[PDB]
């Protein structure tokens, strides 16, 4: 019940929302059908349009007008945004030469530059270039301020998950808005775009910026706007709030536009009908900037122009139907479209088996335009598993396609030519970022970055301490003139042991066998003390950020941090120069595993466990193929370099080690590789403790990794070799799932040169993703600034073209 007989006189767009059955005048009241009777009349005036004209100049104030051209309007803060242009001979902001804003130039009484976030739904990254002739305000923001060529959204590349990620710095799995549509089985409740259940706060985790601001004493405008409030009214309201008295005036604001997303769905991302929406957005920006300039706020406010996601070409004819794969198609519920999520229609149905559904959806048609996954097998870079609202079965859908349950669902609902929601590395899903103002840099281009990083920066812009989030705070310090956040390296928690020779051969009963001078004896000892370690450990040893027991093991060709708990290296580091040679494994050594005399039998793997485990085999972290000499090659067969590997996974690993590492070294002028295992049994994106491990090599305490990582580092300036690099680094990494089959790659019966590299690209990762998963901290000893290293650790090599 709403007693809509209260009134909105003097309460229009009130910042504190009032509690039913008192009626509402806030910018969401329309959406809850709860505005006071007089809201439209008082708060949504439109009389006489949105622009002063010569004749209106000087007029007698008439409170019915949408905006005013009287003399008193400035002090009231309710002039039309073009008043001074039309009535005082001033220029439009867009026509002014840009000038560096070295310091905030704010009116007295401002305690900090305000921040205005101008968010645009579906504003694809390439619009900045391709629409540049029709968006002159936006292009001035872009060229005069700080911009990225594009900004990476989060998966799924839908509106609500992305707006709320922008607001909180959290991955959807952590904030809870995992799609535009959702079932929570604990609530036994559904969430949709349409309707009331999305207004319930229990859907919305973390702490978004407006609440972070409020709790720390910074006042916030209301970010949300009901769809019927026209854009011109949203701008005027923001400008009005900015005219408020110091003790009431907010410091942070958001504008939101439904365009160009709304048109993009109907006409496609580059439909000729898309030029007008782009013009209109630009004109709204112009109105804001002119408005700010009238209030002398145009060199005082920080403005963020940001999108939630892009837009791709998609039509009804490009639909895969699950009815063409499953006989049982009515025993499932599909969340459909540009992704799929599948659960049972009924939990009472005990014959529903996700495994058989997955198999019926796997590599069934030669050009199949979706790929099914258990959520935990999705690429780790998507961070899309650790929420009860994300279904166990997921369909990653090819760009340009839709998935539906049955054909009736498509023609009983062609309408659309644009959609989004695909994989967040797809170019068409990329969006924009521009920062303009005293706190942003001047005429600066920054590299692409992910939208999870912005919450921290908006916090920095407002002098706030951010709630705990998934950004890496400092990785965007290079966007800012000042208010940088100066982080320190996390402290190492466990220090390594440096074991020497302590055990005799005959103390090992491992079931392992191997067919195996004073100048070259002193030599191999000094390789076991770490004489070549400057070569193989280029960026310092990783710091272990939890409590555990481990050993640093030196060798001629590689260095490792060996875990006595997990019985294998946490990391293995080695450098392969451009000049290096690949050799094969000689025959006498094919099944050779050698005891490591620095590590007790009791902290070693054994070969007999692998012999008895019919499913599990083993591989090596430092590849024997890249040994520097026949004598060094013996070190690669130490038991302490061994890790558990399914035969299906060895195909991948072997090809990566034998072929690809040499290739990258050749193309990048040497590489440093750090590889190791990852244990994420509960798919939370975080390092598992021992008691979380669900699988061991049969009959042993040898835990099985869920994934294998490698971090491949070289000199950004590739004319310098990786091991003699003076400047910025360049990195690519991956987190390969450790799977007993290659069902994920439909062409895996072919030669590895046709599918392995493609799999690795799919499983590209940020170093930061690996850190979370391992509890290690990399690049501790470089000659680069820590902020620069943080940027590098957040880098994702995506493998899309320009
Ligand atoms: C991205 O960044 C985020 C934020 O930093 C990271 O997520 C954090 O991860 C932390 C570590 O896993 C986690 O810390 C836990 O907090 C528990 C209390 O949490 C509540 O309070 C916080 C703070 O106010 C609040 O934000 C939480 O909100 C979550 O849950 C509600 C659902 O009710 C949602 O509305 C909301 O969206 C959010 O959901 C997400 O998080 C939860 C987990 O917290 C997930 O399950 C969801 O899927 C979703 O992803 C909470 O209301 C605290 O209880 C935990 O403590 C247990 O484990 C510790 C280990 O130290 C142990 O010492 C304790 O004994 C305790 O165990 C007891 O309970 C167990 C479970 O019932 C039981 O098994 C034991 O036997 C014990 O009895 C833990 O300290 C933190 O909450 C989240 N924060 C957020 C916002 O998600 C995320 O890791 C980052 N991602 C990456 C890849 O880096
Ligand atoms: C989603 C979402 N997450 N955060 N925002 C806020 C946000 C964040 C950012 C910024 F970029 F800065 F983060 C920029 C702009 C915005 C505003 C987006 C917006 O006006 N709309 C129109 C209204 N719909 C419906 C809607 C209505 C009500 C609610 S409530 N609070 O009552 O439960 C939830 C709703 F979804 C959402 C989009 N939107
Ligand atoms: Ca959107
Ligand atoms: Ca985990
Ligand atoms: Cl969805
Ligand atoms: K075996
Ligand atoms: Na296959
Ligand atoms: Zn959309």
Coordinates of C-alpha atoms in Angstrom, one line a residue, residues 330-800:
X330 CA 11.3 -31.2 -21.0
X331 CA 13.1 -32.4 -17.9
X332 CA 15.4 -29.3 -18.1
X333 CA 15.2 -25.6 -17.4
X334 CA 17.4 -23.4 -19.7
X335 CA 18.4 -19.8 -19.0
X336 CA 18.8 -19.0 -22.7
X337 CA 20.4 -16.6 -25.2
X338 CA 24.0 -15.6 -25.5
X339 CA 24.9 -18.0 -22.6
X340 CA 23.2 -21.1 -21.4
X341 CA 22.5 -22.3 -17.9
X342 CA 20.9 -25.7 -17.4
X343 CA 19.2 -27.2 -14.4
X344 CA 16.5 -29.9 -13.7
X345 CA 12.9 -28.7 -14.2
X346 CA 12.1 -30.6 -11.1
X347 CA 14.4 -31.7 -8.0
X348 CA 11.9 -34.6 -7.4
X349 CA 13.2 -36.1 -10.7
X350 CA 15.9 -38.6 -9.5
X351 CA 16.7 -39.7 -13.2
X352 CA 18.2 -36.3 -14.1
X353 CA 22.0 -36.8 -14.6
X354 CA 24.1 -33.7 -15.5
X355 CA 26.8 -36.0 -16.8
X356 CA 24.6 -37.6 -19.6
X357 CA 23.3 -34.1 -20.5
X358 CA 26.9 -32.9 -20.9
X359 CA 27.8 -35.9 -23.0
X360 CA 24.7 -35.3 -25.3
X361 CA 25.8 -31.7 -25.8
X362 CA 29.5 -32.5 -26.5
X363 CA 31.0 -32.1 -30.0
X364 CA 27.9 -33.5 -31.6
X365 CA 27.6 -31.3 -34.8
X366 CA 30.8 -30.4 -36.7
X367 CA 30.3 -26.6 -36.5
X368 CA 28.5 -26.6 -33.1
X369 CA 28.1 -23.0 -31.9
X370 CA 28.2 -23.6 -28.2
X371 CA 30.3 -25.7 -25.8
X372 CA 29.0 -27.2 -22.6
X373 CA 30.9 -27.1 -19.3
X374 CA 30.6 -28.1 -15.7
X375 CA 30.9 -24.6 -14.2
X376 CA 34.1 -25.6 -12.5
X377 CA 35.7 -26.4 -15.8
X378 CA 35.1 -23.0 -17.2
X379 CA 38.2 -21.0 -17.8
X380 CA 39.3 -19.5 -14.6
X381 CA 39.6 -16.1 -16.1
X382 CA 35.8 -15.8 -16.1
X383 CA 35.6 -16.4 -12.4
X384 CA 32.1 -17.8 -12.9
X385 CA 31.4 -20.7 -10.6
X386 CA 31.4 -19.9 -6.9
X387 CA 27.8 -19.0 -6.4
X388 CA 24.7 -21.2 -5.7
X389 CA 22.9 -19.1 -8.3
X390 CA 25.1 -20.3 -11.1
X391 CA 24.0 -23.6 -12.4
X392 CA 26.3 -26.6 -12.5
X393 CA 25.9 -26.9 -16.3
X394 CA 26.9 -23.9 -18.4
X395 CA 27.0 -23.3 -22.1
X396 CA 29.6 -21.0 -23.5
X397 CA 28.0 -19.7 -26.7
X398 CA 29.9 -18.6 -29.8
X399 CA 30.0 -15.0 -30.6
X400 CA 27.0 -14.1 -33.0
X401 CA 24.9 -17.1 -31.7
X402 CA 22.0 -17.9 -29.4
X403 CA 21.1 -21.0 -27.6
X404 CA 17.5 -21.9 -26.9
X405 CA 15.7 -25.0 -25.6
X406 CA 13.1 -25.4 -28.4
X407 CA 12.2 -23.6 -31.6
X408 CA 8.8 -22.5 -30.2
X409 CA 10.7 -20.4 -27.5
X410 CA 12.3 -18.2 -30.4
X411 CA 9.2 -17.5 -32.7
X412 CA 6.7 -17.5 -29.7
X413 CA 8.4 -14.5 -27.8
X414 CA 12.9 -11.8 -36.6
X415 CA 12.9 -9.1 -33.9
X416 CA 16.6 -8.6 -32.8
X417 CA 19.8 -8.0 -34.8
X418 CA 22.1 -7.2 -31.7
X419 CA 22.9 -8.9 -28.5
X420 CA 25.6 -9.3 -25.8
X421 CA 26.4 -11.6 -22.9
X422 CA 29.2 -13.6 -24.6
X423 CA 32.7 -14.4 -23.2
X424 CA 34.3 -11.1 -21.9
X425 CA 37.4 -11.5 -24.1
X426 CA 35.3 -11.1 -27.3
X427 CA 36.1 -7.8 -29.1
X428 CA 32.5 -7.0 -29.8
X429 CA 31.8 -7.1 -26.0
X430 CA 34.5 -4.6 -25.1
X431 CA 33.3 -1.2 -23.8
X432 CA 34.8 2.2 -23.1
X433 CA 36.5 4.3 -20.5
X434 CA 37.3 8.0 -20.4
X435 CA 38.3 9.9 -17.3
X436 CA 38.3 13.7 -17.4
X437 CA 39.1 16.1 -14.7
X438 CA 41.6 17.5 -12.2
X439 CA 42.5 14.1 -10.8
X440 CA 42.9 12.3 -14.1
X441 CA 45.9 12.8 -16.4
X442 CA 45.9 15.1 -19.4
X443 CA 45.9 13.8 -23.0
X444 CA 46.9 10.3 -21.8
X445 CA 46.2 7.0 -23.3
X446 CA 46.4 4.0 -20.9
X447 CA 46.3 0.4 -21.8
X448 CA 43.1 -1.7 -21.7
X449 CA 42.1 -2.8 -18.2
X450 CA 39.1 -4.6 -16.6
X451 CA 36.1 -3.0 -15.1
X452 CA 36.6 -4.7 -11.7
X453 CA 39.5 -2.2 -11.2
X454 CA 37.4 1.0 -11.3
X455 CA 35.7 0.8 -7.8
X456 CA 39.2 1.3 -6.2
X457 CA 39.8 4.3 -8.4
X458 CA 36.5 5.9 -7.7
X459 CA 37.3 5.4 -4.1
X460 CA 40.6 7.1 -4.6
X461 CA 38.8 9.9 -6.4
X462 CA 36.6 10.5 -3.4
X463 CA 39.1 10.0 -0.6
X464 CA 37.4 6.7 0.5
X465 CA 38.8 3.4 1.8
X466 CA 37.4 0.8 -0.6
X467 CA 35.5 -2.3 0.8
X468 CA 37.3 -5.6 0.1
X469 CA 37.0 -6.2 -3.6
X470 CA 38.5 -8.0 -6.7
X471 CA 40.5 -5.0 -8.1
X472 CA 44.2 -4.9 -7.5
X473 CA 44.5 -1.5 -5.8
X474 CA 47.3 0.5 -7.4
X475 CA 47.1 -1.3 -10.8
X476 CA 45.4 1.9 -12.1
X477 CA 47.6 4.5 -10.5
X478 CA 48.8 5.5 -13.9
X479 CA 45.3 6.9 -14.7
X480 CA 45.7 9.5 -12.0
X481 CA 47.5 12.8 -11.7
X482 CA 47.3 12.6 -7.8
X483 CA 45.3 10.6 -5.1
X484 CA 47.4 7.6 -6.0
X485 CA 47.2 4.8 -3.5
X486 CA 50.7 3.6 -2.6
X487 CA 50.5 -0.1 -1.8
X488 CA 53.3 -2.2 -0.3
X489 CA 54.2 -5.8 -1.2
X490 CA 52.5 -8.4 0.9
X491 CA 54.9 -9.8 3.6
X492 CA 56.2 -13.3 3.0
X493 CA 54.7 -15.6 5.6
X494 CA 56.8 -18.7 5.2
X495 CA 60.5 -18.7 4.7
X496 CA 62.1 -21.5 2.7
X497 CA 64.6 -24.1 3.8
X498 CA 67.7 -24.6 1.7
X499 CA 68.4 -28.3 2.1
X500 CA 71.8 -29.7 1.2
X501 CA 72.7 -33.4 0.7
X502 CA 71.1 -35.4 3.6
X503 CA 70.0 -38.8 2.4
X504 CA 71.6 -41.8 0.7
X505 CA 70.1 -43.4 -2.3
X506 CA 69.4 -46.7 -0.5
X507 CA 67.1 -44.9 2.0
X508 CA 64.5 -44.4 -0.9
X509 CA 62.1 -47.2 -1.5
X510 CA 60.0 -45.5 -4.2
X511 CA 59.7 -48.1 -6.9
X512 CA 61.6 -45.7 -9.1
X513 CA 64.4 -46.8 -11.4
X514 CA 66.8 -44.9 -13.6
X515 CA 69.5 -46.1 -16.0
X516 CA 72.2 -43.7 -14.4
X517 CA 86.1 -35.5 -12.3
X518 CA 87.4 -32.5 -10.2
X519 CA 86.8 -29.6 -12.8
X520 CA 83.1 -30.7 -13.4
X521 CA 82.4 -31.9 -9.8
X522 CA 83.1 -28.4 -8.1
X523 CA 80.9 -27.1 -11.0
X524 CA 77.7 -29.2 -10.3
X525 CA 77.9 -28.5 -6.5
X526 CA 77.9 -24.7 -7.3
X527 CA 74.8 -25.3 -9.5
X528 CA 73.2 -27.1 -6.4
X529 CA 74.2 -23.9 -4.3
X530 CA 72.6 -21.6 -6.9
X531 CA 75.3 -20.2 -9.2
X532 CA 73.0 -20.0 -12.4
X533 CA 70.0 -18.8 -10.2
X534 CA 70.4 -15.2 -11.4
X535 CA 69.6 -16.6 -14.8
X536 CA 66.6 -18.8 -13.9
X537 CA 65.1 -16.7 -11.2
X538 CA 64.9 -13.3 -12.9
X539 CA 62.4 -11.5 -10.7
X540 CA 63.2 -12.8 -7.4
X541 CA 61.7 -15.9 -5.8
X542 CA 58.0 -15.8 -5.3
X543 CA 56.9 -15.1 -1.8
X544 CA 54.7 -17.7 -0.1
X545 CA 51.9 -15.8 1.6
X546 CA 50.6 -18.6 3.9
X547 CA 52.0 -21.0 6.5
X548 CA 53.6 -24.1 5.1
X549 CA 56.9 -26.0 4.9
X550 CA 58.9 -25.7 1.8
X551 CA 62.4 -26.0 0.3
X552 CA 64.3 -24.1 -2.4
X553 CA 66.0 -26.6 -4.7
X554 CA 68.7 -25.3 -7.1
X555 CA 69.7 -26.9 -10.4
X556 CA 71.8 -25.9 -13.4
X557 CA 68.7 -25.3 -15.6
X558 CA 65.9 -24.5 -13.0
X559 CA 65.0 -23.5 -9.5
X560 CA 62.0 -24.8 -7.5
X561 CA 60.1 -24.1 -4.3
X562 CA 59.3 -27.7 -3.2
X563 CA 56.3 -28.2 -0.9
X564 CA 56.8 -30.9 1.8
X565 CA 53.1 -30.8 2.4
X566 CA 51.8 -31.3 -1.2
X567 CA 54.9 -33.3 -2.1
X568 CA 55.7 -31.3 -5.3
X569 CA 56.8 -27.9 -6.3
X570 CA 54.6 -24.9 -5.8
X571 CA 56.6 -23.3 -8.5
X572 CA 59.5 -24.1 -10.9
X573 CA 61.4 -21.2 -12.6
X574 CA 63.5 -21.4 -15.7
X575 CA 64.9 -19.3 -18.5
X576 CA 65.1 -20.4 -22.2
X577 CA 67.1 -18.0 -24.3
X578 CA 66.4 -17.4 -28.0
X579 CA 69.4 -19.5 -28.9
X580 CA 68.4 -22.7 -26.8
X581 CA 68.0 -26.1 -28.3
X582 CA 65.3 -28.7 -27.8
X583 CA 66.5 -32.3 -27.4
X584 CA 64.5 -35.4 -26.9
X585 CA 64.4 -37.7 -23.9
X586 CA 67.0 -40.4 -24.6
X587 CA 65.7 -44.0 -24.5
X588 CA 67.7 -45.2 -21.4
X589 CA 66.0 -42.4 -19.5
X590 CA 62.3 -42.9 -20.7
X591 CA 61.0 -44.1 -17.4
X592 CA 63.8 -42.7 -15.3
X593 CA 62.8 -41.1 -11.9
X594 CA 65.6 -40.4 -9.5
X595 CA 65.6 -39.8 -5.7
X596 CA 66.4 -36.3 -4.6
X597 CA 69.1 -36.6 -2.0
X598 CA 68.1 -33.2 -0.5
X599 CA 64.5 -34.4 0.4
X600 CA 63.5 -37.2 2.7
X601 CA 61.8 -40.3 1.3
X602 CA 58.9 -39.3 3.6
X603 CA 58.5 -36.0 1.7
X604 CA 58.8 -37.5 -1.8
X605 CA 56.4 -39.0 -4.3
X606 CA 56.9 -42.6 -5.2
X607 CA 56.7 -44.4 -8.6
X608 CA 54.7 -47.3 -7.3
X609 CA 51.6 -45.2 -6.6
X610 CA 51.6 -44.2 -10.3
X611 CA 52.0 -47.8 -11.3
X612 CA 49.0 -48.8 -9.3
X613 CA 46.9 -45.8 -10.4
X614 CA 45.6 -46.9 -13.7
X615 CA 44.1 -43.4 -14.4
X616 CA 47.0 -41.3 -13.4
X617 CA 50.5 -40.8 -14.9
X618 CA 53.1 -38.2 -14.3
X619 CA 54.9 -35.3 -15.9
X620 CA 57.7 -32.8 -15.1
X621 CA 57.6 -29.2 -14.4
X622 CA 61.0 -28.4 -15.8
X623 CA 60.8 -30.1 -19.2
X624 CA 63.6 -32.6 -19.8
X625 CA 63.4 -31.5 -23.5
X626 CA 65.1 -28.2 -22.7
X627 CA 68.0 -29.4 -20.6
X628 CA 71.2 -27.4 -21.4
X629 CA 73.5 -30.4 -21.5
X630 CA 73.3 -34.2 -21.3
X631 CA 74.6 -34.0 -17.8
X632 CA 72.1 -31.4 -16.6
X633 CA 69.3 -33.5 -18.1
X634 CA 69.5 -35.9 -15.1
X635 CA 68.2 -33.2 -12.8
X636 CA 64.9 -33.0 -14.8
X637 CA 64.2 -36.6 -13.8
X638 CA 64.4 -36.0 -10.1
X639 CA 61.4 -37.1 -8.2
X640 CA 61.0 -33.5 -6.8
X641 CA 60.4 -32.2 -10.4
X642 CA 57.5 -34.8 -10.9
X643 CA 53.8 -34.0 -10.7
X644 CA 50.6 -36.0 -11.4
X645 CA 49.2 -36.0 -14.9
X646 CA 46.4 -37.8 -16.6
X647 CA 47.5 -39.3 -20.0
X648 CA 45.0 -37.0 -21.8
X649 CA 46.7 -34.0 -20.1
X650 CA 50.2 -35.1 -21.0
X651 CA 49.4 -34.6 -24.6
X652 CA 48.8 -31.0 -23.9
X653 CA 51.7 -30.5 -21.5
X654 CA 54.2 -32.4 -23.7
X655 CA 53.4 -30.2 -26.7
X656 CA 53.5 -27.0 -24.7
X657 CA 56.9 -28.1 -23.2
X658 CA 58.5 -29.6 -26.4
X659 CA 57.2 -27.2 -29.0
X660 CA 55.6 -24.0 -27.7
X661 CA 58.1 -22.9 -25.0
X662 CA 60.9 -22.9 -27.7
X663 CA 58.6 -21.0 -30.1
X664 CA 57.8 -18.3 -27.6
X665 CA 61.5 -18.0 -26.7
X666 CA 62.3 -17.6 -30.4
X667 CA 59.5 -15.0 -31.0
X668 CA 60.0 -13.0 -27.8
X669 CA 63.8 -13.2 -27.5
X670 CA 64.1 -15.6 -24.6
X671 CA 61.4 -16.3 -22.0
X672 CA 61.3 -16.9 -18.3
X673 CA 58.9 -19.6 -17.4
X674 CA 57.4 -20.2 -14.0
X675 CA 55.1 -23.2 -13.9
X676 CA 53.3 -25.1 -11.1
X677 CA 50.2 -26.9 -9.9
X678 CA 46.9 -25.4 -8.7
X679 CA 44.4 -27.0 -6.3
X680 CA 41.0 -25.4 -6.5
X681 CA 38.5 -28.3 -5.7
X682 CA 35.8 -25.8 -4.3
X683 CA 36.2 -23.6 -7.4
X684 CA 36.4 -20.4 -5.3
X685 CA 39.4 -19.0 -7.2
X686 CA 41.5 -19.4 -4.1
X687 CA 44.3 -21.7 -3.0
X688 CA 43.0 -24.8 -1.3
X689 CA 44.3 -25.9 2.0
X690 CA 45.3 -29.7 2.4
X691 CA 42.0 -30.7 3.8
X692 CA 40.1 -29.5 0.7
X693 CA 41.8 -31.9 -1.7
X694 CA 39.3 -34.3 -3.1
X695 CA 41.6 -36.6 -5.1
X696 CA 45.1 -38.2 -4.4
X697 CA 47.1 -40.5 -6.6
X698 CA 45.7 -43.9 -5.7
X699 CA 47.0 -45.3 -2.4
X700 CA 49.3 -42.3 -1.6
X701 CA 49.3 -38.8 -0.1
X702 CA 50.1 -37.3 -3.5
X703 CA 47.4 -34.7 -4.2
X704 CA 46.1 -34.2 -7.7
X705 CA 46.1 -30.7 -9.1
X706 CA 42.9 -29.3 -10.7
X707 CA 45.0 -27.1 -12.9
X708 CA 48.6 -26.3 -14.1
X709 CA 49.7 -22.7 -14.6
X710 CA 52.6 -21.1 -16.4
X711 CA 53.7 -17.5 -16.4
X712 CA 55.9 -16.6 -19.4
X713 CA 57.8 -13.4 -19.1
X714 CA 60.1 -11.5 -21.4
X715 CA 61.2 -7.9 -22.2
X716 CA 58.6 -5.6 -23.7
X717 CA 61.4 -4.3 -25.8
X718 CA 62.0 -7.6 -27.6
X719 CA 65.4 -6.5 -29.0
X720 CA 66.7 -7.1 -25.5
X721 CA 66.9 -10.8 -24.3
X722 CA 64.6 -11.8 -21.4
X723 CA 67.7 -12.3 -19.1
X724 CA 69.2 -8.8 -19.8
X725 CA 66.1 -6.6 -19.9
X726 CA 66.4 -3.0 -18.7
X727 CA 62.8 -1.8 -19.1
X728 CA 59.2 -2.9 -18.9
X729 CA 58.3 -6.6 -19.0
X730 CA 55.8 -8.4 -21.1
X731 CA 53.8 -11.4 -19.8
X732 CA 51.4 -14.0 -20.9
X733 CA 50.1 -16.7 -18.6
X734 CA 47.6 -19.6 -18.5
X735 CA 45.7 -21.9 -16.1
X736 CA 45.1 -25.2 -17.9
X737 CA 42.5 -27.4 -16.5
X738 CA 43.9 -30.8 -15.5
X739 CA 41.4 -33.1 -17.0
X740 CA 41.3 -36.9 -17.6
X741 CA 39.9 -36.4 -21.2
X742 CA 40.2 -33.8 -23.9
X743 CA 36.4 -33.6 -24.5
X744 CA 36.8 -29.8 -24.4
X745 CA 38.7 -29.8 -27.6
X746 CA 36.4 -31.3 -30.4
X747 CA 39.4 -31.9 -32.7
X748 CA 41.7 -33.6 -30.1
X749 CA 42.1 -36.8 -32.1
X750 CA 44.1 -34.7 -34.5
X751 CA 47.8 -33.7 -34.0
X752 CA 48.5 -31.4 -31.1
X753 CA 49.6 -28.6 -33.6
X754 CA 45.8 -28.3 -34.5
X755 CA 44.3 -27.9 -31.0
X756 CA 46.6 -27.5 -28.0
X757 CA 47.6 -23.9 -28.6
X758 CA 43.8 -23.1 -29.1
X759 CA 43.1 -24.6 -25.7
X760 CA 45.8 -22.6 -24.0
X761 CA 44.5 -19.4 -25.5
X762 CA 41.0 -20.2 -24.2
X763 CA 42.6 -20.7 -20.7
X764 CA 44.7 -17.5 -20.8
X765 CA 45.1 -15.9 -17.4
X766 CA 46.3 -12.9 -15.4
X767 CA 49.2 -13.4 -13.1
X768 CA 46.9 -12.1 -10.4
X769 CA 44.5 -15.1 -11.1
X770 CA 47.4 -17.4 -10.4
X771 CA 48.3 -15.6 -7.2
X772 CA 44.9 -16.0 -5.8
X773 CA 45.0 -19.7 -6.7
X774 CA 48.4 -20.4 -5.3
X775 CA 48.9 -17.9 -2.4
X776 CA 52.2 -16.8 -4.1
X777 CA 53.4 -13.3 -4.9
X778 CA 55.4 -12.9 -8.1
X779 CA 57.9 -10.2 -9.4
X780 CA 59.2 -9.3 -5.9
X781 CA 62.7 -8.2 -7.2
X782 CA 62.6 -6.1 -10.3
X783 CA 63.9 -2.7 -11.2
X784 CA 60.3 -1.5 -12.0
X785 CA 57.9 0.5 -9.8
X786 CA 55.4 -1.6 -7.8
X787 CA 52.4 0.1 -9.5
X788 CA 53.8 -0.9 -12.9
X789 CA 54.2 -4.5 -11.6
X790 CA 50.6 -4.5 -10.4
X791 CA 49.5 -3.4 -13.9
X792 CA 51.5 -6.2 -15.4
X793 CA 50.0 -8.7 -12.9
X794 CA 46.5 -7.7 -14.1
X795 CA 47.4 -7.9 -17.8
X796 CA 45.4 -10.5 -19.8
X797 CA 46.7 -11.7 -23.1
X798 CA 43.4 -12.2 -24.9
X799 CA 44.4 -13.5 -28.5
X800 CA 41.7 -11.5 -30.2

